[PDB]
């Protein structure tokens, strides 16, 4: 009477960084969506995602970003300590 | 003693009854579980979890008992409780987006006799066997930032800066969230021996 | 005829030019670029001259 | 000035009405739309996307139908989806549809995954030789407007269970260092009733199977019992009780009785339906208003 | 409504012979064909049968059934997809001989324009086999009917990851490559620029910037082939793998020459991939070359030999690159001097005394 089964089923899903919340703070955009300075400048713009800069952490934020930060000051101004680069992203 | 619990599990296995019912019989057997002493208590909980990753057990039964399961746990002896962590911890793995708190209590507790016992990197690669940002739960600031910083603490002690480096800069971004102040004191403090411990000593 | 024009746009331009300006027009550019491919002697004598290979390329120009 | 300027007000209003309109058109109707019909209707509506100030909020409600209608597979004319994308990229500039893009080129990544679990089967197995038909689609989390987080930390009931653990075994095989994260809120599975005389197959979302598959054990099931059983949160539970009381799949202790906690839920066995294998679904009716109201608000 | 289909397609799909099971098959079509999944997916299976036992003659007469159903009720977007799947199994079941004629009677029923992609992916299948086989003058047949469309592969319809015009620019720009001339890759690669605005996202952008690229390096023009092999990165990611192995090194390469913006990895390219040993090497050689320090990029070059040095292009140039080094490692070193020794200098740069000599008369001039 009332017995089921089921072959085959799942949920959809999703993958994550790596990432905490807030938008990936040094920008209000989103780690793939462009943050302030790339959708501005526009001159070619990426399949995927633009430029983004992967740290020692494995979070992430956007190059640019921490790029004009740099130019006065080396330091990463959320981490608030020194950044130094390592991993590239897709 | 283990093999009546095992007959006893085996039994109720096959039923679809009420939760608060057959929780509160597992619970019982659960009981009966935690009062052998040697050998026996060993086996009863191994052959607890066995039943517990079943398919045909349902998952609001399993994650609570296995909550339940847990806080018993630190109780035991180091040597039952080391042997039960990794035995549970390859048994729930098939379900373990569904046991992911449980994943995460016990590696801080397997960790915990790690570091007491002064074998540093097996405690750390244990905290870093917990998801923290890639899972379904994500876990209040504080816990995180902990696992973080106590990840980085256990590389520095086991002369490893660039792991150390990794951890303590993910511990970084939620320190500024955090609101206990000691936790933030220990961050920097830490901080200045991972700068200390990379040869970065004007930073 | 297409062979003067690489021998008359090499030697023409290594008379009068400085080194900036024989980088960027004959030796940067794509379109001289297949006049220069058309007799290697041309082009030899631009670089040999160029690299301070004077002894290789007067011994070519004569 | 004409296009800008008429009877609604606030400048959000239009973003809005345009993508709902979008949309209505987009997903599948009562028999459809053949094709070139929409990409008629299309071209005009680029026009009146121009004179739109603000693109960003359309750029948004857009990307979540656009997400929405690929999830459920509800979509009419793929077609009409693509030519609204390429008409907008012209105008706009390349940037902006990006995104858009990145979202259904992913999907041809899901598309080939989901073939090689179908083909999985052929393979020996005799838990993939059981009952209904399959659903996946592994995506990335900003390539899509859709946000991770806690879904609700729904238990999964245990129909379901099987299945779930076999391709999550499988999908570690695939890529190695990655976790499958959930997203309950969208998928929608189905349901066959053998407590009716007349079976109809409905297709329900995985929320409502799990206050569905209560009714086995005991008849009628307090809101109290449903919440510790299922485990989710007590307003994401109100609309979909909500939902599943106002078709009568599941019916009050009386005729007439107003949507509380403080009433259990009995099984009707006396639903009828005109259509068999009858679909419900797709979470409540009234989010989608109050999303746009709400999002408004915000 | 459905569920007479559903019992007669269930019956149909016992037998387990083609024989009995052909008027069972049958029935579900004569209820019409309006939705028509039920009847498709019925008729699939005796393809499958018929591949497998029977004969092929039989198993073509089958699939016209679903040929000639594309103006009838059975919806376009479904047909397209369902008919992907079932090309895509056969390809891998069986030999060329068979297969090309299924793409052939395809194509036959399609005639009428408002079967933009599904007859470009069938064409494209005979191109990729007519090579293999082969054949010259079919070859050019399909190429001059895919060559009228101007920017376009859709009609404003979905399925355009490829492209119709751009894909012959590929098979141009693939033989020019193996003939190797300079000249005639150049004018291509411009040529198909015009193209390329009105293109979404497909794979053929990255194939065709790829030769872009490396006659771009030739040139001296590193920069445009840095932002190409960039571009088409992302592309090479979704299809993946192998050809994302080789593009990386072309990548790193073009990145160097600029002097320097380096960037191979701040920006986005490998995450997980960088960690195998093949690619690694060129992670640790960008690190030497960026640095400026003769005696790691020289270690990298002896200890890991192969993966640089297999590889014609990037080979070609290495030599260019120790000089490069070399050079903005002296004009470092030159600066706390005023008198400084020839035999000192080529002593620290590691060659002899005469390279340095011709160095330096250049450098200086």
Redesign the interface.
């Given at each position: 009477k009332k017995r089921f089964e089921v072959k085959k089923w799942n949920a959809v899903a999703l993958w994550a960084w790596d990432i905490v919340v807030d938008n990936c703070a040094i920008c209000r955009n989103h780690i793939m969506d462009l943050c302030i300075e790339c959708q501005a400048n526009q001159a070619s713009a990426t399949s995927e995602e633009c430029t983004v800069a992967w740290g020692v952490c494995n979070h992430a934020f956007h190059f640019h970003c921490i790029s004009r930060w740099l130019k006065t000051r080396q330091v990463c101004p959320l981490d608030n300590r020194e950044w130094e680069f390592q991993k590239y992203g897709h | 003693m283990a093999a009546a619990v095992r007959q006893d599990l085996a039994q109720l296995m096959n039923s679809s009854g009420s939760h608060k019912d057959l929780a509160g019989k597992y619970r019982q057997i659960l009981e009966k579980a935690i009062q052998l002493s040697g050998a026996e208590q060993l086996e009863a909980l191994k052959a607890f979890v066995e039943a517990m990753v079943n398919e045909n057990v349902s998952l609001v039964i399993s994650r609570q008992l296995l909550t339940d399961f847990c806080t018993h746990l630190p109780n035991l002896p180091d040597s039952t409780a080391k042997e039960i962590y990794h035995f549970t911890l390859e048994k729930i793995q098939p379900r373990v987006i569904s046991f992911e708190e449980q994943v995460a209590s016990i590696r801080q507790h397997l960790a915990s006799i790690y570091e007491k016992e002064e074998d540093w990197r097996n405690a750390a690669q244990v905290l870093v066997g917990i998801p923290l940002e890639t899972g379904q739960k994500q876990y209040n600031v504080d816990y995180k930032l902990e696992t973080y910083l106590k990840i980085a603490r256990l590389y520095l002690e086991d002369d490893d800066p660039v792991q150390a480096e990794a951890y303590i800069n993910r511990a970084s971004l939620l320190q500024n969230e955090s609101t206990n102040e000691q936790l933030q004191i220990h961050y920097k403090v830490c901080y200045a021996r991972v700068l200390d411990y990379r040869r970065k000593f004007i930073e | 005829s297409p062979s003067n024009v690489a021998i008359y746009g090499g030697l023409c331009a290594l008379a009068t030019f400085d080194?900036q300006e024989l980088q960027r027009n004959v030796?940067?550019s794509?379109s001289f670029k297949?006049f220069l491919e058309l007799e290697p002697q041309v082009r030899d004598i631009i670089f040999k001259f160029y690299?301070?290979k004077y002894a290789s390329c007067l011994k070519m120009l004569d | 000035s004409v296009v800008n300027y008429r009877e609604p007000k606030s400048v959000c209003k239009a973003p809005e009405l345009l993508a709902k309109y979008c949309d209505n058109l987009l997903k599948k109707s009562a028999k459809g739309m053949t094709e070139n019909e929409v990409e008629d209707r299309l071209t005009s509506f680029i026009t009146v996307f121009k004179y739109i100030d603000d693109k960003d909020v359309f750029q948004k409600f857009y990307a979540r139908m656009l997400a929405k209608r690929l999830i459920h597979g509800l979509s009419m004319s793929m077609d009409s989806e693509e030519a609204m994308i390429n008409k907008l990229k012209q105008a706009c500039g390349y940037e902006f549809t990006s995104k858009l893009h990145r979202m259904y080129t992913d999907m041809s990544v899901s598309a080939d995954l989901n073939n090689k679990f179908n083909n999985f089967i052929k393979n020996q197995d005799t838990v993939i030789d059981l009952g209904i038909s399959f659903q996946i689609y592994v995506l990335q989390a900003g390539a899509w407007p859709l946000t991770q987080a806690p879904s609700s930390t729904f238990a999964i009931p245990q129909e379901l269970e099987k299945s779930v653990q076999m391709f999550e075994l499988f999908y570690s095989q695939h890529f190695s260092g990655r976790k499958l994260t959930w997203l309950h809120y969208l998928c929608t599975g189905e349901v066959k009733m053998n407590y009716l005389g007349k079976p109809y197959v409905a297709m329900v979302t995985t929320y409502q199977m799990a206050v569905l598959l209560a009714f086995n054990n005991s008849e009628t099931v307090s809101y109290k019992e449903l919440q510790d059983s299922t485990q989710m949160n007590e307003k994401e539970l109100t609309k979909t009780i909500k939902s599943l009381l106002d078709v009568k799949m599941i019916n009050h202790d009386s005729e007439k009785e107003d949507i509380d906690a403080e009433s259990s839920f009995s099984l009707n066995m006396n639903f009828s339906s005109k259509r068999t294998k009858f679909k419900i679904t797709t979470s409540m009716q009234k989010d989608t208003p109050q999303e746009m109201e709400q999002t408004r608000s915000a | 409504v459905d569920l007479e289909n559903q019992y007669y397609n269930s019956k149909a799909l016992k037998e387990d012979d083609p024989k009995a099971a052909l008027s069972s098959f049958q029935k579900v079509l004569e209820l019409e064909g309006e939705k028509g999944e039920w009847g498709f997916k019925a008729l699939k299976q005796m393809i499958k049968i018929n591949f497998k036992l029977t004969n092929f003659p039989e198993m073509m007469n089958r699939y016209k059934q679903l040929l000639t159903y594309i103006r009838s009720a059975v919806t376009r977007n479904y047909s397209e997809k369902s008919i992907n799947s079932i090309l895509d199994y056969i390809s891998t079941s069986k030999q060329m001989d068979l297969l090309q004629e299924f793409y052939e009677t395809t194509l036959e029923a399609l005639k009428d324009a408002k079967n933009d992609r599904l007859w470009f992916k069938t064409n494209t299948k005979l191109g990729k086999l007519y090579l293999e086989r082969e054949e010259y003058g079919k070859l050019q047949k399909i190429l001059r009917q895919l060559h009228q469309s101007c920017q376009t592969d859709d009609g404003e319809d979905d399925l355009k990851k490829g492209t119709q015009l751009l894909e012959i620019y590929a098979l141009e720009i693939q033989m020019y490559t193996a003939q190797k001339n300079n000249?005639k890759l150049?004018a291509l690669y411009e040529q198909s620029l015009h193209i390329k605005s009105a293109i979404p996202h497909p794979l053929i952008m990255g194939v065709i910037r790829e030769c872009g690229g490396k006659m771009h390096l030739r040139?001296?023009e590193f920069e445009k082939a840095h932002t190409d092999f960039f571009e088409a990165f992302k592309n090479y990611d979704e299809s993946g793998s192998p050809r994302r192995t080789t593009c990386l090194k072309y990548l790193v390469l073009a990145n160097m020459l600029m002097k320097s913006g380096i960037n191979p990895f701040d920006s986005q390219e490998a995450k997980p991939y960088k960690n195998d040993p093949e690619i690694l090497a060129m992670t640790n050689l960008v690190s030497a070359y960026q640095n400026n320090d003769i005696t790691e990029f020289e270690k990298i070059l002896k200890t890991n030999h192969s993966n640089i040095m297999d590889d014609p292009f990037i080979r070609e140039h290495i030599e260019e690159l120790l000089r490069n080094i070399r050079t903005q490692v002296l004009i470092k070193l030159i600066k706390p001097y005023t008198r400084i020794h020839i035999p000192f200098i080529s002593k620290e740069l590691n060659i002899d005394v005469a390279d340095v000599e011709?160095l330096l008369?250049?450098c200086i001039?």
């Open positions: - | - | 080194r030796i940067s794509s297949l690299e301070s | - | 000249k150049k040139e001296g011709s008369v250049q001039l």
